[PDB]
Design a protein around this ligand. Sequence first.
Ligand SMILES: Cc1cc2nc3c(=O)[nH]c(=O)nc-3n(C[C@H](O)[C@H](O)[C@H](O)COP(=O)(O)OP(=O)(O)OC[C@H]3O[C@@H](n4cnc5c(N)ncnc54)[C@H](O)[C@@H]3O)c2cc1C
Ligand SMILES: Cc1cc2nc3c(=O)[nH]c(=O)nc-3n(C[C@H](O)[C@H](O)[C@H](O)COP(=O)(O)OP(=O)(O)OC[C@H]3O[C@@H](n4cnc5c(N)ncnc54)[C@H](O)[C@@H]3O)c2cc1C
Lengths: 521, 521
Amino acid sequence: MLDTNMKTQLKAYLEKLTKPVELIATLDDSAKSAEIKELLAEIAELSDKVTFKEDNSLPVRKPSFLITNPGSNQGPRFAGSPLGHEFTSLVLALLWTGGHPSKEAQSLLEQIRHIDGDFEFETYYSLSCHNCPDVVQALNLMSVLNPRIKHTAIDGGTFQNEITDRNVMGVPAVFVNGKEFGQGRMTLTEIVAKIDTGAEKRAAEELNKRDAYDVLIVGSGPAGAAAAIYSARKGIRTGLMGERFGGQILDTVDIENYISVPKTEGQKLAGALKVHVDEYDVDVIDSQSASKLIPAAVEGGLHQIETASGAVLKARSIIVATGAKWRNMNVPGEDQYRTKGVTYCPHCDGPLFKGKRVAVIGGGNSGVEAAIDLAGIVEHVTLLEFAPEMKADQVLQDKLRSLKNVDIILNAQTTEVKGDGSKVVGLEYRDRVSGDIHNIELAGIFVQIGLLPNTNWLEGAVERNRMGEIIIDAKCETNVKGVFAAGDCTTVPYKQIIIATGEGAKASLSAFDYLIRTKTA
Amino acid sequence: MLDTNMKTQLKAYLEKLTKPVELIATLDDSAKSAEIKELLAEIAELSDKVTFKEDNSLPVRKPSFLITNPGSNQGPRFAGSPLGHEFTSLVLALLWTGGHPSKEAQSLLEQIRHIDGDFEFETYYSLSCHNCPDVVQALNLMSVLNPRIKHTAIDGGTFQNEITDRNVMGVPAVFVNGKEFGQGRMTLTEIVAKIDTGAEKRAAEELNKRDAYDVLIVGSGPAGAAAAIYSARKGIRTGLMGERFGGQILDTVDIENYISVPKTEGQKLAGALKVHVDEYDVDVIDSQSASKLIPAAVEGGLHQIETASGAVLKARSIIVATGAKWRNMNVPGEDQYRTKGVTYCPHCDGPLFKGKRVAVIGGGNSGVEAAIDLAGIVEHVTLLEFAPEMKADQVLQDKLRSLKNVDIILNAQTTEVKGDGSKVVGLEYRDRVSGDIHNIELAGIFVQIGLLPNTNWLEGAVERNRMGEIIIDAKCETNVKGVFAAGDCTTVPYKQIIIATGEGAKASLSAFDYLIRTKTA
Ligand SMILES: Cc1cc2nc3c(=O)[nH]c(=O)nc-3n(C[C@H](O)[C@H](O)[C@H](O)COP(=O)(O)OP(=O)(O)OC[C@H]3O[C@@H](n4cnc5c(N)ncnc54)[C@H](O)[C@@H]3O)c2cc1C
Ligand SMILES: Cc1cc2nc3c(=O)[nH]c(=O)nc-3n(C[C@H](O)[C@H](O)[C@H](O)COP(=O)(O)OP(=O)(O)OC[C@H]3O[C@@H](n4cnc5c(N)ncnc54)[C@H](O)[C@@H]3O)c2cc1C
C-alpha cells in the first residue's frame, strides 16, 4: 500500500545500498498477510539488492518479516504494517542493513557493539502515532549493530490481541526479556543508559580517551601541586596525576616551618593546596600510579606515562614529583606513636623536645648530623647504630663523640617503641651480638635510617644518582629533553615542604620555557 | 677629729695608693678651718703618698679643700667636714685619685669619660645623713673620671648660710650649673642617665658592641626571612639584617601564587613573615645596608660585614639574600600606575589581563618569552624594543613573529604611561630614528628591561656571573667557604616568592651543616 511518492523515494534510497538486503516473511492466510506479502514484493521490485523470501514455518508472529543480509538472521523484525509514520523507520532499517551509515554519534555507536548481555526487545506502536518512530528506529539500529540485541516492532492495529491482553494503554511501549521496559519518547542515548550496568575498571579506560597534555605532573604532593598551579596559570593544558593528593603532609599533624604560617596542620595544608589547585584549570587525577615512562622518539613529540591500572597518558612535557618514603624501624609501637613521639624529621620536630631525652636511629650522615643538631636543643641524645660502626663521615663522628649529653650505642637494633597510651616514654632494643635486650627512657625517637625516592619505576628512562634521586640541574632538567623533576624524589639536598613547593614552581617554569622553544620548532 | 680606728683604717687603705695625692686647702681663721687643717695634716702623716698644701687666695668656699694629683686641678672638693658618715666618701675619693679602681661596671665608667659638656656639681649634706654618701661618692667619681665634670660637696653644718639661703629642706640635695638638679637617694647610673642628651648615630655603635653570630643573613625579604626562621629553629645565634623587612613584596598588592594561599596582599604577607620570624630568637636589624664583605682569613674564623652606617658585624657564616631591583622605564605615569596596570612580572600578573591588550617593554629573552606567554592569555601583545633589533635568541624571535595577535616595534622608546586617574589606558613612545611620537591603547604594561641584583657591593669577595647574579650550587654555596646566598640575587633561574623562600630554607640548612663541620675542626 505504497503510493507513487513512497515508491519513488524508495528507488532513490535503495540506490545507496552497498550490501544485499533480504526480507524474510513468515505469514498466514489472512488479509493482513497478503498486504505484507504485496508490500515486500513491491519493495523487491525497486532494487536488485533487495530480495523477498518466505518461511512460514518459523515460530514468530504472523504476519511478520525480518530485515537482514544473506546467510544471516541478525536484524529487526516488523510485525504488522510498517507503513504510516513508520515508513521512514522501514526505510532507515533497510539502509542500515544495506550498509548505509547511521547519523548517530560515532562514540555512541561503538558502545552498542561492545555491550554485555542478551536483550530481546519488542515495541508496540500504531501507524497514527507521531512519536513511535524514533523509538522503533533507535531499537532497530541496535539489532543491526550487534546480534545479541534483538528487536520486534509490533503494529497494534494488526495485533489487537496483544495490546489488549498485554495491558498497554499508550504507544510507544517497550518490553525487554518479557519484563516491561518503559513508554514514551525515549531517545537512543537514554535507552543505552538503562541497558548498561557497568561500574569498575572504567577509570583506566577514561584515561586513554584523554587528550595529550602540555604538561603532565606525576605525583601530587606539595611539589606537584605547586607545579600544577604555576602551569595552569600560563593557560596551558595541565594534568596532575598522583596516588594520593597531599603527599607526605597528609600523615603529619603540626607544621611550624611553612614560611609565613606560624602553625598549621598537615590535613589542613593538604586541603588548602587542593583549593589553590582547583582555582585554575587543572585536570586532577587521583588514585593512579605511574608504572613506566616512555620518552618521546623525537624532539617535539610526546612522552608517555603508563599506569598500573593499564592506562597510558601522553604529554609534550613531564614533571616527576613522586617524592619519597622515609624508612621505618618496622617494630611494634611505631605506627601507634607517630606524630606522638615517633618522628622522621629533625628539622621539623627538633624544637618540640627542649629539655627532653631523645633517640636517633641511624648512624649515617643524616643520623649523626641529626644527633649533633638535637644535642644543642634537648637534654640528652642517644644514637643507635645497627652496625658495629657508624657509616657517617669521620668529622661528624668525632664531633658527636665530643658532646657531653650524647650516648652512642653500636650493634643496636630497635625492637619496640613504648608509650603510655598517648605518648612515647621509652624504647626497647637488642644487642645484635649478645642478644640481650635493653630499655631506654625517652620522649622522642627520630628515625634517620634512610630515604627511598619513589623512582625505581624510572630505571632506564631518566638518570638517577647512587641514592635513587633523580639528577637535576638548577632548572630541574633531567637527562631527557622535556622531562623535569621536583621535590624529594630529586637530588635536592634537603627535603622540606617549602623547599619542595619552590622546586615545583621552578620545574613548571622550566617546562613552560621548553614548550615555547619546541612548538614552532 | 679622727679617732684611732679611723686613723688605722686610713693607714691600710692609703697603702693601696699607686699615685701621689695632694690635698689643697683654702682656709680662713675660723675654728672650722683649724679643724680641717688639723684633719688634712693628720691624713698627710699616714702616708708618704699624701701631701697637704695650702692656698688661701683661691676663690672657693672657706674652709674647703681639693683632692687631686701633683700638677693638676682636677678632682672633688669638700667644703666643711668630710667626717661622720662621709668618712668613707673621703677615703674612696683618696683611693680613686690615688689610682685605686672603681667597683662600678666597666661600661658605665667609660660612659663618664666620653661625655659631652661641662657640668658643675655641688651637693649639700650633713654628717648625720645616712643616704648622702652614695650620692657624694658617685659625683666624686665623675670628677675624677673626667675634668669637664666638677663637684663640690657642701657640709650643711659648716655652711648654714647656704642651706638656709639656697632653700634646701632636705639632704642630699644636688645642683648643676646653678640650676637645681634633684634630691634623695640617686644612683650613679640614673645621674648619668639625666646628664646624657644623645640621640642619633648611636645605632651603628650599638652594632659593634654586638656579639658574633652563628649565622648572619644579609637582606630581609622572603629569602632572608625563611633562612632566619630555619636557622633560629636550630637554636643557633641568628641575626637578620636588612634595609627594609619585607623586600619586594612590600610594594606589591595582589599575590595569587604563594602556594597554599589563593590570594593575599604584599603588605599582609610581609607582616606574616615578620610574625613568623619573631616566633623564634632572631636578632632583627632593620634600616641597615651591607657595604662590604670581608671573608675570614682562616677556616673556623669569622666573616665580617661592614655597614654604610660605619658599623661592622661578624659571623661564623653568612647568607646573602639581598634580592634585586627590577629596571624601570623611567617615564611619567610609571610610578603612579604601578600595581594598577604597570607591572614587572609576567608570571605574577599575566592571568589578570585575559581579553585585554598589553605591551611588553624589552626585546631580550625575558621580554620575548613574556610576549609569547601573554600572547596565549590576552587579546593582543605589542613588544617595544629600544634597539634596531631584538637581543633574544633566534628561536624565540621566530616564535613571536609567527603569532597572529602580536606587534613588534623596534627603535621604540617609551615616553609616557597613560591612565584615567586609577588605571592604565595607553602608552606613549618615541621612534628613536624619526623622532615621531605614537600612542598605543592598552590595559597592561609589562616592563621586562632587566634585573639588577643588589650585589655590586660584593665585587671581589664572591664570584658572580655575567649578570651580577651570585653563583651558587644546589646547596646555595658560593666560592667562599661559609658564605651562602639565596633568592633573586643568586643564579636561581626564576625569581618568585615561593622560589625565594625555598632557597632561603636551603641556604639555612647548608649553613648549619657548615657549622657542624667547622666547630670541632
Ligand atoms: C611525618 C612527616 C612529617 C613531616 N613534617 C614536615 C614539616 O613539619 N615541615 C616540612 O617542611 N617538611 C615536613 N616533612 C617533609 C615533607 O612532607 C616533604 O619534604 C614533602 O611533602 C615532599 O613533597 P614532594 O611533593 O616532593 O613529595 P611527597 O610529599 O612525598 O609527594 C609525592 C606524591 O607522589 C605520589 N607518588 C609516588 N609515587 C608515585 C607514582 N609512581 N605515581 C604517582 N604518584 C606517585 C606519592 O604517593 C605522594 O602523594 C614531613 C615528612 C613526614 C614523613
Ligand atoms: C611589584 C612586584 C610584584 C611581584 N609580585 C609577585 C607575585 O605576585 N608573586 C611572586 O611569586 N613574586 C612576585 N614578585 C617577585 C618577588 O617579590 C621576588 O622574587 C622576591 O621578593 C625575592 O625575594 P628575595 O628575598 O630573594 O629578594 P627581595 O624581595 O628583593 O629582598 C631583598 C631585601 O634585601 C634588601 N637589601 C638589598 N641590598 C641590601 C644590602 N646591601 N644590605 C642589606 N639589605 C639589602 C632589599 O632592600 C630587600 O629588602 C614581585 C616583584 C615585584 C617587584
